[PDB]
Structure 1
């Protein structure tokens, strides 16, 4: 079980800054700089890491919000959830040190590689995301921000949930803030569409009020080009109006595992921009 958060040290290792080196500055983040480098582990193994710093002259609120990420992330230990290596708090600048992901955010990665992956490669990405979400939901953590931009992808194309948004949010969560693991399943359906669309923006740049109204009226994102029927159906299932009729994450993982085991199933393409009205 996830526990809602002073204890950053309850779930985060305090790292010795001697063991951290910076190789590359990526740019600015919400609370300070973002960079990458190397971490020397207690066993003397050396790994690549992502590093974020808290800006000089931070407010106490900024410090709390910054470190709050680690207090959440550190509760999880799963191959499809970004790993927290630790924090530095006993010297400044304060740091959060996480798993290095060579290929960055999934949406931008896919946009650089439009139509260049096999369907089985895409399904493997999606299965990893679903597995991470099955663990988060098993822990009782509702992410609320599940989107391809918040998924990171490593050198071997393994996708991992990060970031601990009307277009990604379920209708009931928009309507009255009803956030549950089933609203995360809705978001997963949007991620599925993003992946099969190679990082197209969900609902493009439709007015937010129109995204809200169209979805409420039963309109859904259309099938991505050459989308397997099984995967478009899975999107529609994730986008059921009744949250109780959406699949659970365990079911999503099983569905994708079956498609991986029977790749011929992916050859059935949906029959075959604008939204489609979906009555069931």
Structure 2
């Protein structure tokens, strides 16, 4: 659980592509040369013979301030603690000399938002003639997100920014939860200045997060309710897309006032009624009435398939 004491061989990382940016610096796609030497010092790489081993590297700015440097190593320690199939896992680090590095698996299919947008629901031939996804598989995607968040809750770890844009897709519809920050141009519209505070993902936020700034596992459940909606809409629309950002903030006030003026996300066509009612409980006014991730996961893996 402690951070690794010996660095990954920096010289083995060979650059291919830039994957992204951030205030910290860049994330690179790298190839690991002769990876069969290194699994012997695991570093549990999933070397599949006959295939090149690709890897994502989060790299600290070479011009980084001392405080950003400090923050980067704080994250190394946070990431070192996270050990679950549905959470981004640290393969290795490089911190006993510059540049500072965190290394993780490569997910071939990028973020879940862009992946679902490219798919048509199966039975619906409103196609591009073009990738389809079955309803069982939609559910399987959602179940994996639920299981990852359930793991994070056992750690008393609060994510604060769960959404499909922060989920990565590997082979066979496998999912991992990540945390990109909010610099990607593609999702600039998912973040808005809350007065007297910070730029935040208001459309995924529980009312107590918007009004007061209280983030907890129960607010993570609320964000999952919104994330599940996304998945069952196949990411064709932003939550509360009719409403302006200012209206979204006003709507949080109406949840608090609880007088029937608030509005909720409606039921996606792909979502059965039983699953919609569970979805609704995620948005309960009282935190303690929101469902535990254990319940959410069990329903998605079992009951939602037949109803």
> Which residue matches 2:281?
237
Asked if residue 67 in structure 1 is aligned to residue 109 in structure 2, the reply is: no
Contact persistence 1:106–1:150 (CA under 8 A): yes
Contact kept? 2:135, 2:270, Cα under 8 Å: no
The question of whether the paired residues in 2 share the 8 Å contact of 1:142 and 1:179 is answered with yes
Question: Cα gap change, 1:258/1:84 in structure 2, threshold over 3 Å: closer, same or farther?
Answer: same
Q: What is the alpha-carbon distance in structure 1 between the residues aligned to residue 20 and residue 295 of structure 2?
A: 39
Aligned counterpart, 1:264:
306
Q: Give the whole-Å Cα distance in 2 for the aligned partners of 1:226 and 1:27.
A: 32
- Measure, in 2, the Cα distance between the counterparts of 1:60 and 1:245: 43
Listed as ranges, the gaps of 5+ residues in structure 1 are: 1-8, 266-280
2:89 is aligned, of 83, 94, 113, to: 83
How many Å separate the matches in 2 of 1:177 and 1:29?
24
C-alpha contact 1:12 1:84 (8 A) present in aligned 2: no
TM-score by length of 2: 0.77
**C-alpha separation in 2, matches of 1:53 and 1:114:** 36
Once residues 113 and 205 of structure 2 are traced to their aligned partners in structure 1, the CA distance between those partners, rounded to angstroms, is 17
CA distance in 2, matches of 1:203, 1:114: 22
Following superposition of structure 1 onto structure 2, how do residues 1-280 of structure 1 map, counting pairs within 5 Å? 10-12=2-4, 14-39=7-32, 40=35, 41-43=38-40, 46=47, 47-115=53-121, 116-163=132-179, 165-199=201-235, 200-204=237-241, 206-215=243-252, 216=255, 217-259=261-303, 263-265=305-307
Q: CA deviation at 1:184?
A: 0.4
State the secondary structure of the residue aligned to 1:244: helix
Structure 2 spans left out of the alignment, 5+ residues: 48-52, 122-131, 181-200, 256-260
CA contact (8 A) 1:12 1:71 kept: no
- Contact 1:185/1:248 (<8 A) preserved: yes
Separation of aligned partners in 1, 2:18 and 2:90: 19
TM-superposed CA distance for 1:27, in Å, is 4.2
Per-residue deviation at 1:100?
A: 1.1
Residues 96-137 of structure 1, C-alpha deviations (whole Å, 9 max, x = no match):
111211111111111122433111111000000000000100
Q: Give, in whole Å, the separation in 2 of the partners of 1:105 and 1:138.
A: 25
C-alpha distance in structure 2 between counterparts of 1:226 and 1:127, whole Å: 15
**Superposition RMSD in Å:** 2.1
Aligned to 1:269: none
TM-score, normalising length from structure 1? 0.84
Q: Deviation at 1:239? A: 1.0
